[PDB]
PDB file of all heavy atoms in Angstrom:
ATOM      1  N   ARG A   1       0.801  -1.184   0.029  1.00 40.72           N
ATOM      2  CA  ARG A   1       0.011   0.047  -0.051  1.00 40.72           C
ATOM      3  C   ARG A   1       0.768   1.178   0.056  1.00 40.72           C
ATOM      4  O   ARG A   1       0.563   2.241  -0.650  1.00 40.72           O
ATOM      5  CB  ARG A   1      -0.924  -0.014   1.144  1.00 40.72           C
ATOM      6  N   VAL A   2       1.815   1.294   0.795  1.00 41.72           N
ATOM      7  CA  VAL A   2       2.782   2.453   0.999  1.00 41.72           C
ATOM      8  C   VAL A   2       3.690   2.856  -0.134  1.00 41.72           C
ATOM      9  O   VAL A   2       3.760   4.024  -0.474  1.00 41.72           O
ATOM     10  CB  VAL A   2       3.569   2.394   2.350  1.00 41.72           C
ATOM     11  CG1 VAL A   2       4.566   3.501   2.413  1.00 41.72           C
ATOM     12  CG2 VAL A   2       2.654   2.311   3.559  1.00 41.72           C
ATOM     13  N   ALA A   3       4.291   1.850  -0.762  1.00 39.20           N
ATOM     14  CA  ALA A   3       5.231   1.938  -1.817  1.00 39.20           C
ATOM     15  C   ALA A   3       4.665   2.089  -3.231  1.00 39.20           C
ATOM     16  O   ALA A   3       5.477   2.058  -4.128  1.00 39.20           O
ATOM     17  CB  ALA A   3       6.325   0.878  -1.667  1.00 39.20           C
ATOM     18  N   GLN A   4       3.375   2.404  -3.390  1.00 37.53           N
ATOM     19  CA  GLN A   4       2.776   2.787  -4.672  1.00 37.53           C
ATOM     20  C   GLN A   4       3.226   4.119  -5.148  1.00 37.53           C
ATOM     21  O   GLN A   4       3.670   4.366  -6.281  1.00 37.53           O
ATOM     22  CB  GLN A   4       1.234   2.801  -4.699  1.00 37.53           C
ATOM     23  CG  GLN A   4       0.595   1.392  -4.273  1.00 37.53           C
ATOM     24  CD  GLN A   4      -0.856   1.413  -4.199  1.00 37.53           C
ATOM     25  OE1 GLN A   4      -1.421   0.520  -4.904  1.00 37.53           O
ATOM     26  NE2 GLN A   4      -1.485   2.331  -3.712  1.00 37.53           N
ATOM     27  N   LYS A   5       3.078   5.160  -4.268  1.00 40.20           N
ATOM     28  CA  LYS A   5       3.354   6.547  -4.513  1.00 40.20           C
ATOM     29  C   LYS A   5       4.847   6.834  -4.749  1.00 40.20           C
ATOM     30  O   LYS A   5       5.314   7.717  -5.517  1.00 40.20           O
ATOM     31  CB  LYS A   5       2.757   7.584  -3.551  1.00 40.20           C
ATOM     32  CG  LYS A   5       2.793   8.963  -3.820  1.00 40.20           C
ATOM     33  CD  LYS A   5       2.144   9.825  -2.731  1.00 40.20           C
ATOM     34  CE  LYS A   5       2.291  11.321  -2.932  1.00 40.20           C
ATOM     35  NZ  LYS A   5       1.632  11.822  -4.224  1.00 40.20           N
ATOM     36  N   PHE A   6       5.643   6.116  -3.882  1.00 40.54           N
ATOM     37  CA  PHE A   6       7.137   6.415  -3.807  1.00 40.54           C
ATOM     38  C   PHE A   6       8.003   5.370  -4.464  1.00 40.54           C
ATOM     39  O   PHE A   6       8.700   4.575  -3.802  1.00 40.54           O
ATOM     40  CB  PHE A   6       7.510   6.527  -2.260  1.00 40.54           C
ATOM     41  CG  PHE A   6       6.739   7.673  -1.556  1.00 40.54           C
ATOM     42  CD1 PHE A   6       5.412   7.494  -0.995  1.00 40.54           C
ATOM     43  CD2 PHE A   6       7.401   8.976  -1.358  1.00 40.54           C
ATOM     44  CE1 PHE A   6       4.882   8.572  -0.400  1.00 40.54           C
ATOM     45  CE2 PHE A   6       6.846   9.909  -0.816  1.00 40.54           C
ATOM     46  CZ  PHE A   6       5.450   9.759  -0.291  1.00 40.54           C
ATOM     47  N   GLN A   7       7.933   5.432  -5.796  1.00 39.13           N
ATOM     48  CA  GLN A   7       8.896   4.584  -6.575  1.00 39.13           C
ATOM     49  C   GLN A   7      10.205   5.120  -6.678  1.00 39.13           C
ATOM     50  O   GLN A   7      10.393   6.350  -6.301  1.00 39.13           O
ATOM     51  CB  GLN A   7       8.224   4.439  -8.102  1.00 39.13           C
ATOM     52  CG  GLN A   7       6.926   3.685  -8.111  1.00 39.13           C
ATOM     53  CD  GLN A   7       7.193   2.258  -8.699  1.00 39.13           C
ATOM     54  OE1 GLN A   7       6.343   1.780  -9.370  1.00 39.13           O
ATOM     55  NE2 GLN A   7       8.315   1.561  -8.249  1.00 39.13           N
ATOM     56  N   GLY A   8      11.214   4.365  -7.255  1.00 42.77           N
ATOM     57  CA  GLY A   8      12.553   4.826  -7.502  1.00 42.77           C
ATOM     58  C   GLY A   8      13.450   5.250  -6.408  1.00 42.77           C
ATOM     59  O   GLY A   8      14.323   6.136  -6.529  1.00 42.77           O
ATOM     60  N   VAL A   9      13.136   4.603  -5.103  1.00 40.26           N
ATOM     61  CA  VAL A   9      14.005   4.859  -4.082  1.00 40.26           C
ATOM     62  C   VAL A   9      14.999   3.702  -3.917  1.00 40.26           C
ATOM     63  O   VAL A   9      14.662   2.503  -3.598  1.00 40.26           O
ATOM     64  CB  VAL A   9      13.140   4.975  -2.623  1.00 40.26           C
ATOM     65  CG1 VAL A   9      13.992   5.169  -1.509  1.00 40.26           C
ATOM     66  CG2 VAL A   9      12.089   6.064  -2.894  1.00 40.26           C
ATOM     67  N   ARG A  10      16.354   4.206  -4.136  1.00 45.35           N
ATOM     68  CA  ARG A  10      17.311   3.231  -3.974  1.00 45.35           C
ATOM     69  C   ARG A  10      18.562   3.726  -3.188  1.00 45.35           C
ATOM     70  O   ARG A  10      18.641   5.008  -2.953  1.00 45.35           O
ATOM     71  CB  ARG A  10      17.889   2.833  -5.414  1.00 45.35           C
ATOM     72  CG  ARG A  10      17.998   3.910  -6.251  1.00 45.35           C
ATOM     73  CD  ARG A  10      18.724   3.569  -7.580  1.00 45.35           C
ATOM     74  NE  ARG A  10      18.099   2.693  -8.440  1.00 45.35           N
ATOM     75  CZ  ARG A  10      18.452   1.379  -8.584  1.00 45.35           C
ATOM     76  NH1 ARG A  10      19.389   0.890  -7.749  1.00 45.35           N
ATOM     77  NH2 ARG A  10      17.642   0.631  -9.428  1.00 45.35           N
ATOM     78  N   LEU A  11      19.422   2.813  -2.750  1.00 48.39           N
ATOM     79  CA  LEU A  11      20.693   3.286  -2.000  1.00 48.39           C
ATOM     80  C   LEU A  11      21.821   3.607  -2.939  1.00 48.39           C
ATOM     81  O   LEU A  11      22.155   2.875  -3.879  1.00 48.39           O
ATOM     82  CB  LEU A  11      21.135   2.214  -1.016  1.00 48.39           C
ATOM     83  CG  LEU A  11      20.581   2.198   0.393  1.00 48.39           C
ATOM     84  CD1 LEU A  11      21.103   3.293   1.152  1.00 48.39           C
ATOM     85  CD2 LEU A  11      18.968   2.342   0.368  1.00 48.39           C
ATOM     86  N   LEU A  12      22.471   4.748  -2.584  1.00 50.79           N
ATOM     87  CA  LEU A  12      23.739   5.208  -3.402  1.00 50.79           C
ATOM     88  C   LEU A  12      24.958   4.433  -2.807  1.00 50.79           C
ATOM     89  O   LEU A  12      24.952   3.805  -1.804  1.00 50.79           O
ATOM     90  CB  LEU A  12      23.908   6.780  -3.065  1.00 50.79           C
ATOM     91  CG  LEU A  12      22.797   7.669  -3.511  1.00 50.79           C
ATOM     92  CD1 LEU A  12      23.036   9.096  -3.018  1.00 50.79           C
ATOM     93  CD2 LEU A  12      22.564   7.667  -5.000  1.00 50.79           C
ATOM     94  N   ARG A  13      25.907   4.464  -3.619  1.00 49.33           N
ATOM     95  CA  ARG A  13      27.312   3.700  -3.385  1.00 49.33           C
ATOM     96  C   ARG A  13      28.277   4.802  -3.113  1.00 49.33           C
ATOM     97  O   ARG A  13      29.059   5.095  -4.005  1.00 49.33           O
ATOM     98  CB  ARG A  13      27.585   2.849  -4.462  1.00 49.33           C
ATOM     99  CG  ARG A  13      28.662   1.773  -4.264  1.00 49.33           C
ATOM    100  CD  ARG A  13      28.700   0.652  -5.213  1.00 49.33           C
ATOM    101  NE  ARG A  13      29.689  -0.392  -4.988  1.00 49.33           N
ATOM    102  CZ  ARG A  13      31.005  -0.274  -5.412  1.00 49.33           C
ATOM    103  NH1 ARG A  13      31.446   0.902  -6.005  1.00 49.33           N
ATOM    104  NH2 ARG A  13      31.803  -1.076  -5.130  1.00 49.33           N
ATOM    105  N   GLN A  14      28.354   5.320  -1.928  1.00 47.65           N
ATOM    106  CA  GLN A  14      29.085   6.537  -1.547  1.00 47.65           C
ATOM    107  C   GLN A  14      30.540   5.973  -1.289  1.00 47.65           C
ATOM    108  O   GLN A  14      30.881   4.712  -1.116  1.00 47.65           O
ATOM    109  CB  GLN A  14      28.579   7.161  -0.352  1.00 47.65           C
ATOM    110  CG  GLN A  14      27.174   7.756  -0.484  1.00 47.65           C
ATOM    111  CD  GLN A  14      26.673   8.213   0.884  1.00 47.65           C
ATOM    112  OE1 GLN A  14      27.271   8.890   1.651  1.00 47.65           O
ATOM    113  NE2 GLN A  14      25.346   8.054   1.077  1.00 47.65           N
ATOM    114  N   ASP A  15      31.494   6.879  -1.181  1.00 45.65           N
ATOM    115  CA  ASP A  15      32.749   6.647  -0.800  1.00 45.65           C
ATOM    116  C   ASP A  15      32.817   6.369   0.639  1.00 45.65           C
ATOM    117  O   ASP A  15      32.165   7.188   1.467  1.00 45.65           O
ATOM    118  CB  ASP A  15      33.726   7.917  -1.149  1.00 45.65           C
ATOM    119  CG  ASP A  15      35.250   7.676  -0.910  1.00 45.65           C
ATOM    120  OD1 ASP A  15      35.786   6.782  -1.581  1.00 45.65           O
ATOM    121  OD2 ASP A  15      35.788   8.354  -0.045  1.00 45.65           O
ATOM    122  N   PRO A  16      33.580   5.319   1.094  1.00 46.29           N
ATOM    123  CA  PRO A  16      33.608   4.925   2.519  1.00 46.29           C
ATOM    124  C   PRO A  16      34.128   6.068   3.434  1.00 46.29           C
ATOM    125  O   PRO A  16      33.606   6.282   4.593  1.00 46.29           O
ATOM    126  CB  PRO A  16      34.602   3.655   2.638  1.00 46.29           C
ATOM    127  CG  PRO A  16      34.463   3.172   1.200  1.00 46.29           C
ATOM    128  CD  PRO A  16      34.380   4.326   0.449  1.00 46.29           C
ATOM    129  N   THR A  17      35.203   6.840   3.122  1.00 43.64           N
ATOM    130  CA  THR A  17      35.717   7.843   3.849  1.00 43.64           C
ATOM    131  C   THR A  17      34.649   9.062   3.966  1.00 43.64           C
ATOM    132  O   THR A  17      34.471   9.591   5.124  1.00 43.64           O
ATOM    133  CB  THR A  17      37.041   8.450   3.199  1.00 43.64           C
ATOM    134  OG1 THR A  17      37.939   7.279   2.835  1.00 43.64           O
ATOM    135  CG2 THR A  17      37.809   9.320   4.109  1.00 43.64           C
ATOM    136  N   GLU A  18      34.100   9.469   2.800  1.00 45.79           N
ATOM    137  CA  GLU A  18      33.245  10.507   2.708  1.00 45.79           C
ATOM    138  C   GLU A  18      31.936  10.165   3.602  1.00 45.79           C
ATOM    139  O   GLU A  18      31.430  11.057   4.349  1.00 45.79           O
ATOM    140  CB  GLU A  18      32.651  10.757   1.243  1.00 45.79           C
ATOM    141  CG  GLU A  18      31.799  12.030   1.098  1.00 45.79           C
ATOM    142  CD  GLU A  18      31.649  12.443  -0.287  1.00 45.79           C
ATOM    143  OE1 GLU A  18      32.672  12.600  -0.998  1.00 45.79           O
ATOM    144  OE2 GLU A  18      30.478  12.680  -0.751  1.00 45.79           O
ATOM    145  N   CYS A  19      31.438   8.976   3.407  1.00 47.59           N
ATOM    146  CA  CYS A  19      30.305   8.356   4.234  1.00 47.59           C
ATOM    147  C   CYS A  19      30.606   8.332   5.702  1.00 47.59           C
ATOM    148  O   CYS A  19      29.670   8.607   6.461  1.00 47.59           O
ATOM    149  CB  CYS A  19      29.878   7.045   3.649  1.00 47.59           C
ATOM    150  SG  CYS A  19      28.383   6.437   4.302  1.00 47.59           S
ATOM    151  N   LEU A  20      31.766   7.888   6.060  1.00 48.08           N
ATOM    152  CA  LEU A  20      32.143   7.707   7.546  1.00 48.08           C
ATOM    153  C   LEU A  20      32.099   9.038   8.349  1.00 48.08           C
ATOM    154  O   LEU A  20      31.379   9.087   9.310  1.00 48.08           O
ATOM    155  CB  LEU A  20      33.471   6.942   7.632  1.00 48.08           C
ATOM    156  N   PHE A  21      32.868   9.977   7.961  1.00 48.62           N
ATOM    157  CA  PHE A  21      33.035  11.268   8.504  1.00 48.62           C
ATOM    158  C   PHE A  21      31.860  12.069   8.562  1.00 48.62           C
ATOM    159  O   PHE A  21      31.654  13.093   9.335  1.00 48.62           O
ATOM    160  CB  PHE A  21      34.186  11.928   8.088  1.00 48.62           C
ATOM    161  CG  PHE A  21      35.540  11.458   8.565  1.00 48.62           C
ATOM    162  CD1 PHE A  21      36.334  10.735   7.542  1.00 48.62           C
ATOM    163  CD2 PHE A  21      35.964  11.551   9.851  1.00 48.62           C
ATOM    164  CE1 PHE A  21      37.532  10.216   8.021  1.00 48.62           C
ATOM    165  CE2 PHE A  21      37.081  10.955  10.236  1.00 48.62           C
ATOM    166  CZ  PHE A  21      37.969  10.301   9.334  1.00 48.62           C
ATOM    167  N   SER A  22      30.923  11.892   7.538  1.00 47.72           N
ATOM    168  CA  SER A  22      29.592  12.598   7.494  1.00 47.72           C
ATOM    169  C   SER A  22      28.668  12.147   8.678  1.00 47.72           C
ATOM    170  O   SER A  22      28.072  13.004   9.292  1.00 47.72           O
ATOM    171  CB  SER A  22      28.924  12.415   6.124  1.00 47.72           C
ATOM    172  OG  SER A  22      29.578  12.928   5.116  1.00 47.72           O
ATOM    173  N   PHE A  23      28.510  10.833   8.965  1.00 45.97           N
ATOM    174  CA  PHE A  23      27.741  10.346   9.927  1.00 45.97           C
ATOM    175  C   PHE A  23      28.185  10.334  11.368  1.00 45.97           C
ATOM    176  O   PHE A  23      27.498  10.099  12.293  1.00 45.97           O
ATOM    177  CB  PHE A  23      27.119   8.888   9.550  1.00 45.97           C
ATOM    178  CG  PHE A  23      26.139   8.841   8.523  1.00 45.97           C
ATOM    179  CD1 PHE A  23      26.501   8.482   7.245  1.00 45.97           C
ATOM    180  CD2 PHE A  23      24.851   9.329   8.791  1.00 45.97           C
ATOM    181  CE1 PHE A  23      25.425   8.385   6.176  1.00 45.97           C
ATOM    182  CE2 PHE A  23      23.801   9.203   7.855  1.00 45.97           C
ATOM    183  CZ  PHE A  23      24.160   8.779   6.532  1.00 45.97           C
ATOM    184  N   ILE A  24      29.560  10.625  11.438  1.00 45.97           N
ATOM    185  CA  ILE A  24      30.224  10.782  12.697  1.00 45.97           C
ATOM    186  C   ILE A  24      29.735  12.145  13.414  1.00 45.97           C
ATOM    187  O   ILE A  24      29.510  12.222  14.602  1.00 45.97           O
ATOM    188  CB  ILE A  24      31.732  10.770  12.635  1.00 45.97           C
ATOM    189  CG1 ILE A  24      32.092   9.335  12.603  1.00 45.97           C
ATOM    190  CG2 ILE A  24      32.348  11.290  14.042  1.00 45.97           C
ATOM    191  CD1 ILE A  24      33.520   9.216  12.044  1.00 45.97           C
ATOM    192  N   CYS A  25      29.445  13.156  12.557  1.00 46.93           N
ATOM    193  CA  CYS A  25      28.997  14.449  13.000  1.00 46.93           C
ATOM    194  C   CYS A  25      27.384  14.615  12.635  1.00 46.93           C
ATOM    195  O   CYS A  25      26.948  15.601  12.190  1.00 46.93           O
ATOM    196  CB  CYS A  25      29.688  15.608  12.240  1.00 46.93           C
ATOM    197  SG  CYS A  25      29.786  15.615  10.419  1.00 46.93           S
ATOM    198  N   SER A  26      26.678  13.544  12.837  1.00 43.87           N
ATOM    199  CA  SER A  26      25.224  13.388  12.701  1.00 43.87           C
ATOM    200  C   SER A  26      24.589  13.035  13.965  1.00 43.87           C
ATOM    201  O   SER A  26      23.740  12.214  14.007  1.00 43.87           O
ATOM    202  CB  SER A  26      24.873  12.527  11.468  1.00 43.87           C
ATOM    203  OG  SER A  26      25.050  11.218  11.890  1.00 43.87           O
ATOM    204  N   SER A  27      25.073  13.674  15.085  1.00 40.72           N
ATOM    205  CA  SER A  27      24.692  13.251  16.473  1.00 40.72           C
ATOM    206  C   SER A  27      23.551  14.070  16.900  1.00 40.72           C
ATOM    207  O   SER A  27      23.692  15.283  17.373  1.00 40.72           O
ATOM    208  CB  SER A  27      25.805  13.365  17.447  1.00 40.72           C
ATOM    209  N   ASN A  28      22.318  13.717  16.809  1.00 41.53           N
ATOM    210  CA  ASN A  28      21.011  14.357  17.078  1.00 41.53           C
ATOM    211  C   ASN A  28      20.708  15.635  16.319  1.00 41.53           C
ATOM    212  O   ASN A  28      20.207  16.582  16.870  1.00 41.53           O
ATOM    213  CB  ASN A  28      21.008  14.611  18.691  1.00 41.53           C
ATOM    214  N   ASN A  29      21.213  15.665  14.975  1.00 44.12           N
ATOM    215  CA  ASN A  29      21.061  16.765  14.233  1.00 44.12           C
ATOM    216  C   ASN A  29      20.340  16.400  13.044  1.00 44.12           C
ATOM    217  O   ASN A  29      20.407  15.285  12.497  1.00 44.12           O
ATOM    218  CB  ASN A  29      22.345  17.289  13.839  1.00 44.12           C
ATOM    219  N   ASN A  30      19.507  17.367  12.487  1.00 45.72           N
ATOM    220  CA  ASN A  30      18.614  17.187  11.352  1.00 45.72           C
ATOM    221  C   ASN A  30      19.471  17.218  10.068  1.00 45.72           C
ATOM    222  O   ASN A  30      20.653  17.434  10.058  1.00 45.72           O
ATOM    223  CB  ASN A  30      17.378  18.144  11.218  1.00 45.72           C
ATOM    224  CG  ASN A  30      17.788  19.631  11.092  1.00 45.72           C
ATOM    225  OD1 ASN A  30      18.868  19.960  11.448  1.00 45.72           O
ATOM    226  ND2 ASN A  30      16.928  20.311  10.546  1.00 45.72           N
ATOM    227  N   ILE A  31      18.768  17.119   8.973  1.00 41.75           N
ATOM    228  CA  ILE A  31      19.368  17.059   7.493  1.00 41.75           C
ATOM    229  C   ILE A  31      20.007  18.467   7.130  1.00 41.75           C
ATOM    230  O   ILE A  31      21.133  18.538   6.665  1.00 41.75           O
ATOM    231  CB  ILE A  31      18.372  16.729   6.391  1.00 41.75           C
ATOM    232  CG1 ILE A  31      17.979  15.321   6.487  1.00 41.75           C
ATOM    233  CG2 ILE A  31      19.061  16.972   5.063  1.00 41.75           C
ATOM    234  CD1 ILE A  31      16.688  15.010   5.825  1.00 41.75           C
ATOM    235  N   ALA A  32      19.384  19.536   7.485  1.00 43.12           N
ATOM    236  CA  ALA A  32      19.811  20.911   7.311  1.00 43.12           C
ATOM    237  C   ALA A  32      21.148  21.361   8.020  1.00 43.12           C
ATOM    238  O   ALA A  32      21.957  21.829   7.578  1.00 43.12           O
ATOM    239  CB  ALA A  32      18.794  21.993   7.567  1.00 43.12           C
ATOM    240  N   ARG A  33      21.255  20.852   9.313  1.00 43.03           N
ATOM    241  CA  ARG A  33      22.323  21.011  10.177  1.00 43.03           C
ATOM    242  C   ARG A  33      23.623  20.184   9.692  1.00 43.03           C
ATOM    243  O   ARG A  33      24.664  20.685   9.646  1.00 43.03           O
ATOM    244  CB  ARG A  33      21.969  20.666  11.683  1.00 43.03           C
ATOM    245  CG  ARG A  33      23.142  20.861  12.652  1.00 43.03           C
ATOM    246  CD  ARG A  33      22.656  20.860  14.028  1.00 43.03           C
ATOM    247  NE  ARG A  33      23.693  20.643  15.186  1.00 43.03           N
ATOM    248  CZ  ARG A  33      24.545  21.597  15.532  1.00 43.03           C
ATOM    249  NH1 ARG A  33      24.539  22.869  14.907  1.00 43.03           N
ATOM    250  NH2 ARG A  33      25.428  21.273  16.396  1.00 43.03           N
ATOM    251  N   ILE A  34      23.411  19.065   9.382  1.00 43.62           N
ATOM    252  CA  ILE A  34      24.452  18.107   8.883  1.00 43.62           C
ATOM    253  C   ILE A  34      25.004  18.518   7.528  1.00 43.62           C
ATOM    254  O   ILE A  34      26.148  18.559   7.247  1.00 43.62           O
ATOM    255  CB  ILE A  34      23.967  16.636   8.842  1.00 43.62           C
ATOM    256  CG1 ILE A  34      23.578  16.027  10.193  1.00 43.62           C
ATOM    257  CG2 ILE A  34      25.043  15.774   8.135  1.00 43.62           C
ATOM    258  CD1 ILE A  34      22.656  14.915  10.083  1.00 43.62           C
ATOM    259  N   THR A  35      24.098  19.044   6.615  1.00 43.95           N
ATOM    260  CA  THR A  35      24.367  19.548   5.325  1.00 43.95           C
ATOM    261  C   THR A  35      25.303  20.836   5.539  1.00 43.95           C
ATOM    262  O   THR A  35      26.295  21.045   4.669  1.00 43.95           O
ATOM    263  CB  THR A  35      23.206  19.869   4.450  1.00 43.95           C
ATOM    264  OG1 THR A  35      22.483  18.596   4.337  1.00 43.95           O
ATOM    265  CG2 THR A  35      23.609  20.329   3.084  1.00 43.95           C
ATOM    266  N   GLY A  36      25.040  21.616   6.427  1.00 42.98           N
ATOM    267  CA  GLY A  36      25.851  22.765   6.767  1.00 42.98           C
ATOM    268  C   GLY A  36      27.313  22.511   7.290  1.00 42.98           C
ATOM    269  O   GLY A  36      28.230  23.050   6.883  1.00 42.98           O
ATOM    270  N   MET A  37      27.276  21.469   8.236  1.00 40.67           N
ATOM    271  CA  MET A  37      28.593  20.929   8.696  1.00 40.67           C
ATOM    272  C   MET A  37      29.414  20.410   7.616  1.00 40.67           C
ATOM    273  O   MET A  37      30.683  20.866   7.633  1.00 40.67           O
ATOM    274  CB  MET A  37      28.382  19.838   9.778  1.00 40.67           C
ATOM    275  CG  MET A  37      27.785  20.443  11.064  1.00 40.67           C
ATOM    276  SD  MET A  37      27.439  19.085  12.281  1.00 40.67           S
ATOM    277  CE  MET A  37      27.043  20.007  13.751  1.00 40.67           C
ATOM    278  N   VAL A  38      28.963  19.593   6.740  1.00 39.69           N
ATOM    279  CA  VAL A  38      29.706  18.924   5.634  1.00 39.69           C
ATOM    280  C   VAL A  38      30.177  19.916   4.710  1.00 39.69           C
ATOM    281  O   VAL A  38      31.369  19.847   4.108  1.00 39.69           O
ATOM    282  CB  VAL A  38      28.912  17.796   5.073  1.00 39.69           C
ATOM    283  CG1 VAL A  38      29.723  17.298   3.790  1.00 39.69           C
ATOM    284  CG2 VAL A  38      28.642  16.671   5.957  1.00 39.69           C
ATOM    285  N   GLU A  39      29.342  20.900   4.356  1.00 39.24           N
ATOM    286  CA  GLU A  39      29.740  21.956   3.413  1.00 39.24           C
ATOM    287  C   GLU A  39      31.002  22.848   3.941  1.00 39.24           C
ATOM    288  O   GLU A  39      31.961  23.185   3.303  1.00 39.24           O
ATOM    289  CB  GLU A  39      28.589  22.897   3.171  1.00 39.24           C
ATOM    290  CG  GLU A  39      28.841  23.981   2.040  1.00 39.24           C
ATOM    291  CD  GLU A  39      27.589  24.581   1.615  1.00 39.24           C
ATOM    292  OE1 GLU A  39      26.748  25.024   2.515  1.00 39.24           O
ATOM    293  OE2 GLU A  39      27.335  24.604   0.318  1.00 39.24           O
ATOM    294  N   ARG A  40      30.817  23.246   5.274  1.00 38.96           N
ATOM    295  CA  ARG A  40      31.874  24.016   6.034  1.00 38.96           C
ATOM    296  C   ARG A  40      33.212  23.236   6.092  1.00 38.96           C
ATOM    297  O   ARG A  40      34.261  23.700   6.207  1.00 38.96           O
ATOM    298  CB  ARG A  40      31.438  24.638   7.394  1.00 38.96           C
ATOM    299  CG  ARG A  40      30.289  25.714   7.102  1.00 38.96           C
ATOM    300  CD  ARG A  40      30.071  26.505   8.412  1.00 38.96           C
ATOM    301  NE  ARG A  40      29.417  25.501   9.520  1.00 38.96           N
ATOM    302  CZ  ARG A  40      28.177  25.118   9.328  1.00 38.96           C
ATOM    303  NH1 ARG A  40      27.334  25.539   8.512  1.00 38.96           N
ATOM    304  NH2 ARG A  40      27.616  24.299  10.344  1.00 38.96           N
ATOM    305  N   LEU A  41      33.005  21.872   6.417  1.00 40.19           N
ATOM    306  CA  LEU A  41      34.151  20.944   6.639  1.00 40.19           C
ATOM    307  C   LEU A  41      34.950  20.807   5.311  1.00 40.19           C
ATOM    308  O   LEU A  41      36.129  20.860   5.388  1.00 40.19           O
ATOM    309  CB  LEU A  41      33.593  19.542   6.964  1.00 40.19           C
ATOM    310  CG  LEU A  41      34.591  18.452   7.204  1.00 40.19           C
ATOM    311  CD1 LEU A  41      35.581  18.795   8.402  1.00 40.19           C
ATOM    312  CD2 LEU A  41      33.838  17.130   7.590  1.00 40.19           C
ATOM    313  N   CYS A  42      34.344  20.635   4.155  1.00 39.78           N
ATOM    314  CA  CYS A  42      35.047  20.609   2.916  1.00 39.78           C
ATOM    315  C   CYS A  42      35.488  21.973   2.439  1.00 39.78           C
ATOM    316  O   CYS A  42      36.641  21.916   1.681  1.00 39.78           O
ATOM    317  CB  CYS A  42      33.986  20.058   1.798  1.00 39.78           C
ATOM    318  SG  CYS A  42      33.374  18.403   2.112  1.00 39.78           S
TER     319      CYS A  42
END
């Protein structure tokens, strides 16, 4: 029932280094906060 409207949802194959350090600084923070941290980090 749920997955009728939401087609085309799949997992990306990210770089392990890029993926690791992004989620280390995702401690109780939303998408907007984490996106800001990663942008300023790079």
Side-chain angles (χ1 to χ4, degrees), residues 2-19 21-26 30-42:
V2 170
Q4 297 187 131
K5 191 180 173 67
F6 298 86
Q7 290 258 221
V9 177
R10 45 164 67 258
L11 272 284
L12 301 169
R13 193 160 178 282
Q14 299 173 41
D15 188 59
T17 313
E18 188 168 312
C19 188
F21 288 106
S22 296
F23 285 105
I24 289 162
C25 58
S26 69
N30 68 330
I31 295 159
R33 183 165 162 77
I34 298 158
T35 304
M37 287 175 173
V38 172
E39 191 168 44
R40 291 189 297 282
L41 181 60
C42 298

